[PDB]
Amino acid sequence: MRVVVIGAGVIGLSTALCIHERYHSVLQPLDVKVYADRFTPFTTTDVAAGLWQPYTSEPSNPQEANWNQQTFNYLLSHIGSPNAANMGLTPVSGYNLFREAVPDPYWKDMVLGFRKLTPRELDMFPDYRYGWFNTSLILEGRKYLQWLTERLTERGVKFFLRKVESFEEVARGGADVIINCTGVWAGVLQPDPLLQPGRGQIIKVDAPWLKNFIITHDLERGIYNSPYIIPGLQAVTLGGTFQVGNWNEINNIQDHNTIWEGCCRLEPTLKDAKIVGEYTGFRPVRPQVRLEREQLRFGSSNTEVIHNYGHGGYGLTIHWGCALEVAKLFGKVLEERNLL
Amino acid sequence: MRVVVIGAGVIGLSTALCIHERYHSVLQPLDVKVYADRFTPFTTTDVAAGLWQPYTSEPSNPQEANWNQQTFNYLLSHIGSPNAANMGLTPVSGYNLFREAVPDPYWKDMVLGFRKLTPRELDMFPDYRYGWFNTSLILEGRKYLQWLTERLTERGVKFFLRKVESFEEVARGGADVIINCTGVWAGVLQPDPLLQPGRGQIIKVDAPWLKNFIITHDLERGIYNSPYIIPGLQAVTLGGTFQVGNWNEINNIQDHNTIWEGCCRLEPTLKDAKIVGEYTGFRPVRPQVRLEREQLRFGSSNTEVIHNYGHGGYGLTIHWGCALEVAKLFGKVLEERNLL
Ligand SMILES: Cc1cc2nc3c(=O)[nH]c(=O)nc-3n(C[C@@H](O)[C@H](O)[C@@H](O)COP(=O)(O)OP(=O)(O)OC[C@H]3O[C@@H](n4cnc5c(N)ncnc54)[C@H](O)[C@@H]3O)c2cc1C
Ligand SMILES: Cc1cc2nc3c(=O)[nH]c(=O)nc-3n(C[C@@H](O)[C@H](O)[C@@H](O)COP(=O)(O)OP(=O)(O)OC[C@H]3O[C@@H](n4cnc5c(N)ncnc54)[C@H](O)[C@@H]3O)c2cc1C
Ligand SMILES: Nc1ccccc1C(=O)O
Ligand SMILES: Nc1ccccc1C(=O)O
Numbered sequence: 312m313r314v315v316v317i318g319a320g321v322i323g324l325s326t327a328l329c330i331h332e333r334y335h336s337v338l339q340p341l342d343v344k345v346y347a348d349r350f351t352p353f354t355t356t357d358v359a360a361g362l363w364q365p366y367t368s369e370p371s372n373p374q375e376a377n378w379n380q381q382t383f384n385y386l387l388s389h390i391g392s393p394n395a396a397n398m399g400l401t402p403v404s405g406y407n408l409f410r411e412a413v414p415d416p417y418w419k420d421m422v423l424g425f426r427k428l429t430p431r432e433l434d435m436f437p438d439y440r441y442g443w444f445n446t447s448l449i450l451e452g453r454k455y456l457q458w459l460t461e462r463l464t465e466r467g468v469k470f471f472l473r474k475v476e477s478f479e480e481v482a483r484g485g486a487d488v489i490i491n492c493t494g495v496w497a498g499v500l501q502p503d504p505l506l507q508p509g510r511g512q513i514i515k516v517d518a519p520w521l522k523n524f525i526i527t528h529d530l531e532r533g534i535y536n537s538p539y540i541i542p543g544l545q546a547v548t549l550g551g552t553f554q555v556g557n558w559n560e561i562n563n564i565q566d567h568n569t570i571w572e573g574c575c576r577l578e579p580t581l582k583d584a585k586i587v588g589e590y591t592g593f594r595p596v597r598p599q600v601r602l603e604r605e606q607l608r609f610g611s612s613n614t615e616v617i618h619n620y621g622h623g624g625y626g627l628t629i630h631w632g633c634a635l636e637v638a639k640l641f642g643k644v645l646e647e648r649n650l651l
Numbered sequence: 652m653r654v655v656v657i658g659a660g661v662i663g664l665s666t667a668l669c670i671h672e673r674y675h676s677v678l679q680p681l682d683v684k685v686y687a688d689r690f691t692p693f694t695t696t697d698v699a700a701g702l703w704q705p706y707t708s709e710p711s712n713p714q715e716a717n718w719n720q721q722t723f724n725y726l727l728s729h730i731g732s733p734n735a736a737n738m739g740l741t742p743v744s745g746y747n748l749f750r751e752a753v754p755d756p757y758w759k760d761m762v763l764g765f766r767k768l769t770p771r772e773l774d775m776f777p778d779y780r781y782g783w784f785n786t787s788l789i790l791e792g793r794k795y796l797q798w799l800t801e802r803l804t805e806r807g808v809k810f811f812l813r814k815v816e817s818f819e820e821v822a823r824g825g826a827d828v829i830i831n832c833t834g835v836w837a838g839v840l841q842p843d844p845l846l847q848p849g850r851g852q853i854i855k856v857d858a859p860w861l862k863n864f865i866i867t868h869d870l871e872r873g874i875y876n877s878p879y880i881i882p883g884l885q886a887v888t889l890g891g892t893f894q895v896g897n898w899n900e901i902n903n904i905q906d907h908n909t910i911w912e913g914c915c916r917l918e919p920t921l922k923d924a925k926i927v928g929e930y931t932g933f934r935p936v937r938p939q940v941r942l943e944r945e946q947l948r949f950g951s952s953n954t955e956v957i958h959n960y961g962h963g964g965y966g967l968t969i970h971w972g973c974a975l976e977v978a979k980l981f982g983k984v985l986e987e988r989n990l991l
Binding site for chain 1: 730863922
């Protein structure tokens with residue numbers, strides 16, 4: 312079987328791994344190749360704050376809730392083991408701050424020990440009068456991608472640096488099944504007017520004393536268009552922009568001041584922090600995650616394509632649920648071919 | 652008035668500043684000198700793990716409960732301000748794990764968001780079936796000491812490296828009021844059978860990925876004779892020895908092994924951690940905190956002596972409530988001798 316994954320971000324590699332584990336023993340040659348024009352440090356995943364937290368609003372597709380759940384559990388199960396940190400995994404507690412009372416998120420029972428903030432805790436955040444506290448996990452994009460790559464590589468997965476112009480060429484290449492995990496750039500392979508970029512900029516700072524994550528929410532400006540501080544494995548992410556439709560790939564000084572200025576007010580001690588880097592990435596926004604099979608004929612070429620992209624700003628959070636769903640779909644592909 | 656404070660640890664310096672802040676505006680010449688033979692990096696306070704957490708056991712002297720409270724509130728008020736991290740302060744959340752069910756601590760309502768761990772949270776710690784989770788504060792001893800010193804220095808307080816062989820010499824030295832904050836060595840200046848050292852050894856390792864504190868409790872071996880992981884500002888403290896009656900100042904190999912092994916079992920990721928330093932210190936173990944006024948005549952001298960020592964393993968945790976008490980006792984002196 313020749314499977315070609317197009318994409319080397321969290322979604323692409325998780326899907327590749329999940330498949331190899333799942334069918335390597337039943338399928339004779341399970342040729343798995345990864346095609347991508349951007350690898351590790353250059354993918355959107357590397358710009359991710361690295362926190363597990365779905366949107367505060369219910370998913371359009373309920374199945375996405377299950378996928379989020381499955382991902383937390385999968386990751387939680389790696390906590391009590393060495394190498395957990397090596398794969399970019401670590402527990403972290405934090406605050407979700409609001410200027411007004413809001414309803415509980417559907418994911419309240421998924422995270423560890425969720426509760427509302429007491430007035431004495433809210434005294435530490437004088438600009439907010441409502442909030443939640445909870446424990447969750449940090450899944451550092453880059454570290455995780457390096458890990459996956461290590462696991463994929465030793466699994467016999469070959470990686471190829473190349474921009475696919477069309478599924479057709481991959482199909483002509485001999486790919487029996489193509490897993491499309493191209494993120495925000497999916498519309499290029501196939502027009503998808505529902506897929507649009509959610510430009511986000513972040514500042515990575517060196518402020519080790521910061522132990523808890525702090526996410527402020529502005530219901531007026533929309534999700535993530537508010538300052539947040541997310542401590543990672545060894546640097547803190549300062550952020551605050553979510554601009555849908557914007558394709559500007561360059562760091563905007565406009566945003567730099569909003570983020571920095573917004574974060575230092577939240578955390579005055581940030582004044583002593585040292586800036587390590589400024590990044591911009593496009594969250595693959597879509598009303599629903601596109602995860603489905605699609606047949607392509609080409610006359611005696613009938614290639615199978617399984618899509619899995621458009622995970623907006625919850626790609627690290629839902630990654631395993633989607634990967635498992637793709638493996639399940641890949642299973643049907645084999646059953647159609649009587650491959651078991 | 653000439654006040655001589657003996658001791659440069661958290662207790663000494665805290666008392667010095669509190670007295671100075673309070674009376675420097677009303678006392679005519681307020682001469683405050685701090686005598687000490689061991690300064691900052693070499694005091695027990697620098698070896699301290701840096702967590703604010705009283706004993707799980709009820710307080711002997713009911714008043715210590717209140718001092719612990721006063722201190723937490725004093726520290727908490729620095730949270731929302733810059734320099735909080737410069738004085739060694741930073742919020743931290745963590746677990747207190749038990750092998751058996753235990754009543755809540757008297758301080759359950761002093762810390763932020765106290766609650767018991769859930770079975771699913773306990774699945775992260777297979778060796779224990781009970782525990783609490785709560786948010787407390789980190790007060791890096793060394794940093795706090797440097798901070799206090801700077802404040803005291805710009806306040807006009809003078810520091811002298813000297814070993815006070817007795818109170819008398821100091822009294823004869825022209826000391827109207829002597830604040831005795833000699834910690835575990837107070838027995839030398841005045842025999843105290845109730846004061847015994849609770850030697851403790853710790854290992855400071857570099858493991859930035861650890862954001863939460865984990866403290867294990869084994870009732871059979873007594874307080875702090877069980878593995879604990881306390882993340883500091885920019886290093887983690889591993890520990891677990893509370894040896895009363897032990898006067899050994901050098902690092903024990905067996906103790907190194909008790910800490911390292913036990914901590915790696917609790918937290919497996921500790922394997923990638925680079926050991927930064929190994930230290931031993933003596934908690935001033937005493938059934939009660941000695942904090943009282945004592946009159947030493949010496950024939951015509953009649954020097955006031957206020958003791959403030961025997962804070963066991965909660966010196967950082969109680970420091971402020973005590974300094975405020977000393978400052979109160981000091982006020983009385985002023986009124987008696989009619990200086991105010
Ligand atoms: C500021 C910011 C913060 C965020 N923080 C979080 C967070 O803390 N939590 C969370 O869950 N989510 C977060 N995200 C969301 C985000 O990380 C996404 O969900 C993203 O990681 C989804 O992964 P992906 O594999 O779909 O995309 P990507 O990482 O972008 O990978 C896409 C891959 O496809 C390849 N590719 C594309 N087109 C082609 C082509 N034509 N030919 C060959 N190769 C191609 C690319 O090279 C790349 O390898 C954040 C995003 C941003 C930008
Ligand atoms: C491993 C360990 C972990 C601990 N962790 C915590 C923790 O996380 N939380 C917490 O609340 N506390 C902790 N402690 C408790 C501990 O730090 C004490 O409570 C301590 O700081 C009390 O402070 P002190 O000022 O009395 O003594 P010290 O800080 O030791 O200072 C005593 C001072 O007296 C001086 N002195 C003594 N005799 C003379 C003399 N005759 N002449 C001149 N000067 C003299 C000494 O030189 C020194 O300057 C821990 C202790 C240890 C060892
Ligand atoms: N997905 C996230 C989770 C937490 C904080 C920020 C983000 C973000 O989209 O930038
Ligand atoms: N007082 C403490 C608080 C937390 C961890 C250790 C200690 C200790 O005394 O060693």
